[PDB]
Amino acid sequence: GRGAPLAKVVFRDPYKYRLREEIFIANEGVHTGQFIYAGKKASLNVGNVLPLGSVPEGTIVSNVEEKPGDRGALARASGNYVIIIGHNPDENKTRVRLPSGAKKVISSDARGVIGVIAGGGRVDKPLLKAGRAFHKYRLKRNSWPKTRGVAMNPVDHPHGGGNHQHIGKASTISRGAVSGQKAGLIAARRTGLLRGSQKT
Amino acid sequence: SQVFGVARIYASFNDTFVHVTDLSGKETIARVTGGMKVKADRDESSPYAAMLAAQDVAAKCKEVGITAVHVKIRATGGTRTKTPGPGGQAALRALARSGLRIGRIEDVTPVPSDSTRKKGGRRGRRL
Amino acid sequence: AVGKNKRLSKGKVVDPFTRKEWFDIKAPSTFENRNVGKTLVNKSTGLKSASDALKGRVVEVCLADLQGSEDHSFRKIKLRVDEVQGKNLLTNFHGMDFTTDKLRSMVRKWQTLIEANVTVKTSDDYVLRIFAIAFTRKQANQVKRHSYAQSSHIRAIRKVISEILTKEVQGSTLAQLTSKLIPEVINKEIENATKDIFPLQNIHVRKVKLLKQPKFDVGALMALHG
Amino acid sequence: MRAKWRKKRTRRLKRKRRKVRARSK
Amino acid sequence: PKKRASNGRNKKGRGHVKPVRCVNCSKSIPKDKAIKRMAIRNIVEAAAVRDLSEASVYPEYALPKTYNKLHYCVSCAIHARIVRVRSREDRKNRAPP
Amino acid sequence: AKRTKKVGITGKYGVRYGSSLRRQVKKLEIQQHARYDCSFCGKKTVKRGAAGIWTCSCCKKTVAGGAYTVSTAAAATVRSTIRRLREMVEA
Amino acid sequence: TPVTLAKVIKVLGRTGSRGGVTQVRVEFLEDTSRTIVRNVKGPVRENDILVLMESEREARRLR
Amino acid sequence: SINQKLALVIKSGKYTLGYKSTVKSLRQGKSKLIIIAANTPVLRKSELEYYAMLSKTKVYYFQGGNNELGTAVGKLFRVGVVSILEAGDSDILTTL
RNA sequence: GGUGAAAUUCUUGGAUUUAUUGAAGACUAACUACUGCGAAAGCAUUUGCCAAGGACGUUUUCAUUAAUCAAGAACGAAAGUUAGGGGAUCGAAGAUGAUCAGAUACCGUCGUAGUCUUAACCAUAAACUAUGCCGACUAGGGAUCGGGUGGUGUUUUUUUAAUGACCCACUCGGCACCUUACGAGAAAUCAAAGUCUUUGGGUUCUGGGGGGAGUAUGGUCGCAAGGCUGAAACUUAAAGGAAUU
RNA sequence: GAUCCUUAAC
């Protein structure tokens, strides 16, 4: 159900004689038998777990924390990464750019794995097959197949019913709409094909 | 005792920015440009309007209390025309007539080493 | 556009100088002139402590002003304020530069222009990118019109310039670099190293850029013991 | 009539002929 | 017929040279066909020379001069009158006034 | 002989799914089924286990890589950028 | 209103599309060796004294 | 350069390819140069460097993996380490 | 901010001027030339690695191994196509302000594809020197690039044992320039477009009034756009080249 | 910057 490989990596317990085994999101280039270095003093190498205050601008990070200690939230999907936009030491914070293109200021103590995540290019290949889609969602969850609401009865959906399959009312739904109404394009600022780019 | 700022003249086309800053550049004094002196839009780069803006700047910076100014004059530059506007000739004369002492005049127009791409198209501006 | 702006404010003065005050800026001990000028700052309110806003200012200053000599007029030096102590903030070397007029005057056609650049780290952990320019000259008694270089002279010249610069920086800290840059010992040294390859006049060193700042300067040398 | 625009017009005609023949095929 | 044995440019043994954009219209012209003129002027425009000399803090100042090579296209060169049409036998003169 | 003109590995899909989709699937499937050079033991024994997992049969090392290639262009760009920043930091 | 009385020393030729002005060289009675170039809408001879409100202009051409 | 002198050794000198023969020659003390590929296991590099420190044998790290080292030594197979027993007409021993 | 003038747009939520910076992508100015290399397309930051090349010099080797070439191939600006990456600038389409009798144009402000790169296609340009390649001979002159040769010629090591860069002449090989006409040509002009009615050095390709028409059809290559091959029916007395006032 | 056009040849 995950596009990216995971990395079984073992550290030593600093306080007791015992090995501690961790679950990492494998960055592209990590291999078995590779030493990785987690800490604020580590080098800027792929797989290391520097804080953002320790990495410089332009750094590719992944598995970045939102707050220091939540053990990774940002840029965890296959092939995704976070860009270190900039720093400010006073009121220690770091501006970063997220995979969606959004900028976020988060504390400089939050950690991340240097590099990009393995499994990149996954959505490049067309499934070609409802069977491939079936096996893809069989491990994820029960979200497939998707019946169109226009193809159902008015009891079952806002879009259902009619002598022709059509929505009837505008398919853009307001944010303040209630459950049972939020079917279609929720809070759509605009619709239709964009003759444009992301424009981050 | 001579305390000096830096002139920072921008003699673009259709505009003449004149504003004196400190020797560091981080603190600015008297940011006046041709528009604030001339009403008609076609004369924001007129020599008269640039002279007026420059003398206004000179009065403000002398009443702030600096005696000398090192001149740094600049055209639009980069990709653009690189030929300074009438303000370049008008403003320095305006400061000299005001009587603010002048030193170390230098052209600081930003030239590119292999500029990105000119504007106007391959056939250019077919006016 | 005095009467063109339909709205000056979409949402709907106190003179800055009154809250502002002057500060005095000094150079390091490698230049014959110490004072370089004055600078406005906001008043050091306890919430803000404008000393921090001072600690990050850079001033471009003419080497002619820093040396009282007209022959240094075409060079300029960036001085970065790094230490503030009581209205006599003193800077440090940040980078040297030329004047665009001097560069464009020294650049002429019917001759070859050679450029070299190095990224060498000094012995006091400073990392300097140095650029050195050089031009070809027609010899006396020459009748040829242009006096270009055969692109192997250019390569050997660039190699020798790079190694002279690297050897000079590797062995001297920043202060020695400034104190040997201002008499331009490099120019005659490199002409001596090159003259058996191609005449090559106008071998000035162009701009130089820094990357570092000093530490907290507590015990022996130049900043507090008095 | 510029030769380049006449060439373009002939390509337009060629495309239309090929379309109608593809239909009739 | 062939107006100019040089094809109105300077290309013999090249085939292709990198173009340069014009300064008036920003037309993309070949460099050999451009009409480059070097502009070298005093910054003060020579009417305020004495004014700036007396207003300067340093006597015997150099009064620096600006430099720029300036590229023209064939269309704007004739309009700007930096070049003009000449006689058929007068087109062969290669030297400047 | 040359058994197929252009469908190559995608001859298994026969006629269905559309020529363009089969073309893209060809381009990615040759990559995902090719053997890659192991940078450790130096011999072409790196195969894809699953999307992102690339095992070497001889040196018994698994590398984390692209879904259909052992390494992606974005990964190489990231490696170069990280190297440049690291070297700049050290000196 | 401060005015400057300056005498014309050189006539440089009629200037403008219609020739309604002449480009002239004017030297001030005070601060001699300060020379300026201006335009005069009428005809001018030598030893001709011109009263001007503001002396801070150069009039090079008119087209 | 380096591949040129290695080829000269191959033409004139005597050499052994491979870690086992390399370690044997190091033990018997008759090897003079060791050339170690770039991608050979670093544990093997440590072992060979220890053997060479014991033997007082010069070690040179080839700027290339076993494939390129084999190509430089003239063979069509991978070579992780090559010990030059003598060169004769090559100055490979004296230099580097 | 732009413009002849404006306007679209951004502004007591400071891009639009400065100081420090940081990032991205493209680009490689000035030096830059009647200069260089490459078969052409084309190629201009430093260094390294890889293989290649012209010219020169040779009292080196082989000895006709050569010239051009249907078929058949390699490379081929830009735009364009497929899909990744990239996506700063400029910008077919489009939005929009102006001009205008109209303006789905020029002008102004944005802006998707594109511009960039990887893999695969495409195979066209005024791809021009509108001049096929090889070989020989026929005027002069200076300049320039690369190589070589000669000169009690010029300057710094160390004016003392080696030399680089210059100066003079010669030569080979180039990119090219001035004049007449030996000649040529319809002329413009041409050291080749000369040595062709005093007609023959070798060889390849192409044309036969203007259209219809690079169309139709059949092949063939391409994902497509299209490329290559390529008519006829019919129509027309001119269409064209170079110079004159 | 609107200065768009000219009952048909001889």
PDB file of C-alpha atoms in Angstrom, chain B residues 105-108, chain C residues 74 76 98-107, chain E residues 41-43 62-67:
ATOM      1  CA  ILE B 105      31.108  59.352  -9.115  1.00  0.00           C
ATOM      2  CA  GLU B 106      30.801  55.943 -10.779  1.00  0.00           C
ATOM      3  CA  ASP B 107      28.487  54.181 -13.229  1.00  0.00           C
ATOM      4  CA  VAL B 108      26.922  51.152 -11.539  1.00  0.00           C
TER       5      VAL B 108
ATOM      6  CA  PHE C  74      39.990  52.316  -9.434  1.00  0.00           C
ATOM      7  CA  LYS C  76      37.025  49.502  -3.981  1.00  0.00           C
ATOM      8  CA  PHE C  98      37.046  47.196  -9.270  1.00  0.00           C
ATOM      9  CA  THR C  99      35.131  50.087 -10.791  1.00  0.00           C
ATOM     10  CA  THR C 100      33.093  49.385 -13.906  1.00  0.00           C
ATOM     11  CA  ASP C 101      34.689  52.371 -15.638  1.00  0.00           C
ATOM     12  CA  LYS C 102      38.196  51.057 -14.994  1.00  0.00           C
ATOM     13  CA  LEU C 103      37.281  47.572 -16.222  1.00  0.00           C
ATOM     14  CA  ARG C 104      35.619  48.898 -19.376  1.00  0.00           C
ATOM     15  CA  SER C 105      38.543  51.264 -19.999  1.00  0.00           C
ATOM     16  CA  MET C 106      41.081  48.466 -19.667  1.00  0.00           C
ATOM     17  CA  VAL C 107      39.005  46.252 -21.987  1.00  0.00           C
TER      18      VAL C 107
ATOM     19  CA  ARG E  41      31.321  59.494 -23.149  1.00  0.00           C
ATOM     20  CA  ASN E  42      32.078  61.500 -20.051  1.00  0.00           C
ATOM     21  CA  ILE E  43      29.419  60.857 -17.418  1.00  0.00           C
ATOM     22  CA  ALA E  62      39.530  61.944 -12.883  1.00  0.00           C
ATOM     23  CA  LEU E  63      35.909  62.662 -13.909  1.00  0.00           C
ATOM     24  CA  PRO E  64      35.267  59.090 -15.071  1.00  0.00           C
ATOM     25  CA  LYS E  65      33.853  58.155 -18.477  1.00  0.00           C
ATOM     26  CA  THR E  66      31.318  55.498 -19.448  1.00  0.00           C
ATOM     27  CA  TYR E  67      31.952  52.728 -21.986  1.00  0.00           C
TER      28      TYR E  67
END
